[PDB]
Amino acid sequence: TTNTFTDPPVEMAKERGKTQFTVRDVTNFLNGGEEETQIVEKIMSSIERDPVLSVTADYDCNLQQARKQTMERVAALSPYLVTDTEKLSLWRAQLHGMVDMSTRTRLSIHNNLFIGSIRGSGTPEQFKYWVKKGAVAVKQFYGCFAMTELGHGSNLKGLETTATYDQDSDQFIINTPHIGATKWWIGGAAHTSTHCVCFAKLIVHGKDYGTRNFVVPLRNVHDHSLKVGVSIGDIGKKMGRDGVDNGWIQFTNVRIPRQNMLMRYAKVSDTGVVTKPYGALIRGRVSMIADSFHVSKRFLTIALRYACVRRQFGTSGDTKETKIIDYPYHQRRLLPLLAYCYAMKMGADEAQKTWIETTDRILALNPNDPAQKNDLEKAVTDTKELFAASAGMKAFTTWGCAKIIDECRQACGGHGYSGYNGFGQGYADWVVQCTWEGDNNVLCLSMGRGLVQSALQILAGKHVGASIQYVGDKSKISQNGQGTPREQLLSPEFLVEAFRTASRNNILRTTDKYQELVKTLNPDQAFEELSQQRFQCARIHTRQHLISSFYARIATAKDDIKPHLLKLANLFALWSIEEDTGIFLRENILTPGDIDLINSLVDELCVAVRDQVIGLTDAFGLSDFFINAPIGSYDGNVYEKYFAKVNQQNPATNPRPPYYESTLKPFLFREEEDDEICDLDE
């Protein structure tokens, strides 16, 4: 009646049959309402219809093909640069970034980083000028963002490129003093760009005034050749995003007008330097929280769809083997990952909201206009703390996405290794997402230190950010050895407390260690000695914030969905205990007996979520174009489509390799040279 080949689409039909809610309600919940789900669906249709942007064949492209295709795609996407608002421009990017991270980046380098920066750091006259030149329209103008150097990436303050003021010419002289200063990883430079935003040390009359930005032209627009003193090359093969043309730039005494420097925050005239002694960087990290979500959901959808139809190994005496989604072991490997992926979106969303509700808080206040007082640096402090929290959020969610890609791949067995299922291509581009815009490990160490700082402010009884006030708290919870009951362990209120408690304890323990250390050591030294502890504190503090933010959203959810989201939220919170059993045991928040009960609670919550997976993955609202993997087809018709794919991209008419005559045949049919041995007397 059905065989292995034909069973899958049928089985996928029973599972979509189990769904107890309206999918689109979960889609509106994720995306933040009916209005936005229709916003993202117009975006998605543009992308998927457009023939130029098609991704069917991207997996077989070699490096040359990818670059050219990315360029064509960028040309295709350019009309939306005039149309799109900041929200839409960014949204278009993130959604297109699920299947094509090369084009996203080749376009983002100009319209997000170059433009971002000359709007951000240029005076209104300047921005206006570059626009007249073609900047925004991208006519005869393509930009790029030259910050990083071969020798410096993380340390902006350490950059060695120089910009020296020459009054006799009224120009800047841009110079790379040696090859260590060579600009590096600059997207669009190798082959695309006609201008960059160079980041350079400001030098005037032999003084260093720190790092500034300059608009350096690289190419003569009309034949694309390099300007005098500009050297550029192609960085070449990368681990991923081979469609982006990252190059190196070296400047040998390049002369630009003084005016080319961007002077919103710092000015030069006639040797005079007037600094008049942020949002972009945070609206960039919050953008990546949402990135982790968009990409993750793709690979979970693939893996979980596959699990609903793949059968291997069953013991139940039934005629057909067990669907791997019905193995609790498999549910453990993926369903808490599905829960996590939900909470990234919440987390991303809440960080945008708290960000706007604080930059409004500062601006609605008169800093200059003291009500006889400026006493509200408290609004200012809350902002810095939010900026700390966004750092851990970027790090752990980009790591989490990375970890989800890898688990989902492994969960599809050998078929996870086929290029047509997307796991290979998708992991590499994403790993670049872990390094740029703040090295995840630097970020976490900074945040941890900031957290210690903040607790010393609490210990000194001063105001701190809303987001870390909780370290000043006393716990609702005390474990006397009398282990926690089920109705506690399934409580969001309880669960939120447990994590805040574990996070507070850690921080307070670190903080104590540090003060005690400081007795024999310097402040910078004492942090180095507590760097593991600092990293842990970033970890626990970000997770708890994520747990809370997920519950805080369920409460506002439509009732029909709510019981299901709660099941997802509980799985995420309890699972999180299991990954950190040692932590909760060290504070004696929980007991051994207790964790064997946690064990059973995730089991039990796995079976519940499991029941509704097709629904909770159809919720992401992805067409098969955005899946871009035959084993994750909405259809479930997995083996049929995968074979079709393999045959479409690789026509098998010929049984021999193109190297058959040159290589294979002459090796299989090789003669033997003689084993005869030279004559010798005696």
Q: Which residues are annotated as a binding site for FAD?
A: 148, 187
Among its own copies, ligand FAD, none, partner that 88 touches (CB below 5 to 8 angstroms by kind): none
Among ligand FAD, its own copies, none, partner that 147 touches (CB below 5 to 8 angstroms by kind): ligand FAD
Pick from 401, 377, 444, 443: which is nearest to 294 by CA? 401
Tokens linked to 170: 């009224």
Binding status of residue 167 toward its own copies by CB under 8 A: no
Among ligand FAD, its own copies, none, partner that 186 touches (CB below 5 to 8 angstroms by kind): ligand FAD
Binding status of residue 281 toward its own copies by CB under 8 A: no
* Residues 134, 135, 137, 140, Cα dihedral to 10°: 50
Q: How far is the CB of 484 from its own copies (least distance, A)?
A: 14
Q: What string marks each residue from 209 to 238 as x (binds its own copies by CB under 8 A) or -?
A: ----------x-x--xxx----xxxxxxxx
Tokens linked to 310: 């793949």
Tokens linked to 272: 């005079």
Among its own copies, ligand FAD, none, partner that 260 touches (CB below 5 to 8 angstroms by kind): none
Q: Which residues contact 475 (CB under 8 A, 6 or more apart)?
A: 497, 501, 504
Query: Taking CB under 8 A as the criterion, which residues in 627-656 touch its own copies?
Result: 639-640, 642-643, 646-647, 649-650, 652, 655-656
- Stretch of 102-110, 115-123, 164-172, 409-417 lying at the interface with its own copies (CB under 8 A): 409-417
Residue 425 near residue 419, CB atoms below 8 Å: yes
DSSP conformation class of 109:
I
Tokens linked to 114: 């170059």
d(CA 329, CA 603): 9
- Stretch of 11-19, 100-108, 175-183, 560-568 lying at the interface with its own copies (CB under 8 A): 175-183
SS3 359: helix
Binding status of residue 17 toward its own copies by CB under 8 A: no
Angstrom CA distances, 350 to 96, 118, 289, 361, stand at 23, 28, 11, 16
Pick from 126, 169, 171, 116: which is nearest to 147 by CA? 116
Tokens linked to 637: 């018709």
Query: Taking CB under 8 A as the criterion, which residues in 321-360 touch its own copies?
Result: 321, 327-329, 332-333
Q: How far is the CB of 528 from its own copies (least distance, A)?
A: 6
d(CA 77, CA 442): 34
Name which position in 21, 29, 130, 142 contacts its own copies (CB under 8 A). 142
Angstrom CA distances, 644 to 420, 633, 639, stand at 11, 13, 9
Count of residues of this chain found to bind its own copies when the rule CB under 8 A is applied:
138
End-to-end, the C-alpha distance of the chain in Å comes to 82
In what order do the strands lie in the sheet containing 247-251?
183-186, 247-251, 230-234
Please, what's the b/e burial string for 566-587 (b: 16 or more CB within 10 A of its CB; e: otherwise)?
bbbbbbbbbbbbeebeebbeeb
Question: How many C-beta atoms surround the C-beta of residue 327 within 10 A?
Answer: 16
Among its own copies, ligand FAD, none, partner that 33 touches (CB below 5 to 8 angstroms by kind): none
Among ligand FAD, its own copies, none, partner that 145 touches (CB below 5 to 8 angstroms by kind): ligand FAD
Binding status of residue 25 toward its own copies by CB under 8 A: no
Q: How far is the CB of 379 from its own copies (least distance, A)?
A: 28
The residue whose Cβ lies closest to ligand FAD is 153
Name which position in 34, 50, 72, 170 contacts its own copies (CB under 8 A). 72
Among its own copies, ligand FAD, none, partner that 589 touches (CB below 5 to 8 angstroms by kind): none
Q: How far is the CB of 227 from its own copies (least distance, A)?
A: 10
Query: Taking CB under 8 A as the criterion, which residues in 491-550 touch its own copies?
Result: 522, 524-525, 528-529, 531-533, 535
Nearer to ligand FAD among residue 531 and residue 648 (C-beta) = 531
Nearer to its own copies among residue 405 and residue 464 (C-beta) = 405
Binding status of residue 658 toward its own copies by CB under 8 A: yes
d(CA 207, CA 268): 13
Note if 437 is an active site residue.
Answer: yes
Q: Which residues contact 485 (CB under 8 A, 6 or more apart)?
A: none
Q: How far is the CB of 315 from ligand FAD (least distance, A)?
A: 8
- Stretch of 334-342, 348-356, 559-567, 580-588 lying at the interface with its own copies (CB under 8 A): 580-588
Catalytic pick among 437, 578, 604, 640: 437
Tokens linked to 33: 């309402």
Q: Which residues contact 524 (CB under 8 A, 6 or more apart)?
A: none
Binding positions:
148, 187
Q: How far is the CB of 79 from its own copies (least distance, A)?
A: 8
Query: Taking CB under 8 A as the criterion, which residues in 437-456 touch its own copies?
Result: 439-441, 445
Tokens linked to 341: 């992926």
* SS3 per-residue string spanning 118-167: HHHCCCHHHHHHHHHHCCCCCCCCCCCEECCECCCCCCHHHCCCEEEEEC
Name which position in 420, 470, 550, 551 contacts its own copies (CB under 8 A). 420
Among ligand FAD, its own copies, none, partner that 580 touches (CB below 5 to 8 angstroms by kind): its own copies
Among ligand FAD, its own copies, none, partner that 37 touches (CB below 5 to 8 angstroms by kind): none
Give the bridge partners for 232, in sequence order: 249
d(CA 452, CA 508): 8
CA dihedral (451, 453, 454, 460) positive or negative: positive
- Stretch of 138-146, 286-294, 377-385, 467-475 lying at the interface with its own copies (CB under 8 A): 138-146
Give the bridge partners for 249, in sequence order: 183, 232
Nearer to its own copies among residue 33 and residue 657 (C-beta) = 657
Q: How far is the CB of 476 from its own copies (least distance, A)?
A: 21
Q: How far is the CB of 531 from its own copies (least distance, A)?
A: 4
Name which position in 68, 132, 353, 558 contacts its own copies (CB under 8 A). 68
Residues that bind ligand FAD (CB under 6 A): 109, 145, 147-148, 152-154, 185-187, 238, 241, 246, 310, 312-313, 324, 327, 329-330, 410-411, 413-415, 417, 432, 435-437, 439, 441-442, 445, 531
SS3 114: helix
Catalytic positions are 437
